[PDB]
Design a protein around this ligand. Sequence first.
Ligand SMILES: O=S(=O)(NCc1ccccn1)c1ccc(Br)c2ccccc12
Ligand SMILES: [Br-]
Length: 182
Amino acid sequence: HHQTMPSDLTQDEFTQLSQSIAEFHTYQLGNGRCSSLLAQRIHAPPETVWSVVRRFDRPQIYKHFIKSCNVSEDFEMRVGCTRDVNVISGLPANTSRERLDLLDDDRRVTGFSITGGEHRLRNYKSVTTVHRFEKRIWTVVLESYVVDVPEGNSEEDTRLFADTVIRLNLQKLASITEAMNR
Ligand SMILES: O=S(=O)(NCc1ccccn1)c1ccc(Br)c2ccccc12
Ligand SMILES: [Br-]
């Protein structure tokens, strides 16, 4: 018997989601890369959670640390389209340019890449999936990513970093989506 964190999946969680992990949240590692997987349980229906997560043009809605995110005018939210996001002042990243890779309203799957900008997460690729859970009906959100490990940094350092941003983001996501409830 061991000890995991709360971002790591529980057993019941993993047995239901394993296939999803197999398909969407698994990356080719090795050679200065690193990846990670985070879960968040949310006492709200998947449909609500998905509608927020999918808003590629308005990540501010739940991601932290965004001063602004501009898309273009002839911007239609569809695969290949992009967003220029500006981070608040005082952080170790100023701007990010991200491309939408993946948008499936049927399977509630989405993902973007960073291509890139003023920061040190080179070639970051993320995927986020939402799932239904029953026993009283809740949601589980999985977010994973892979990204390059910068010159004089450890892979553990890089994972810690990305993990934190994602972890807080999902907490915000949880928070607003549970917010109205019923
Ligand atoms: O532009 S982002 O909103 N990208 C979304 C994002 C970026 C990285 C991890 C998870 N999610 C963003 C926010 C905060 C930090 Br620190 C970032 C640092 C580098 C690049 C982008 C950054
Ligand atoms: Br950075």
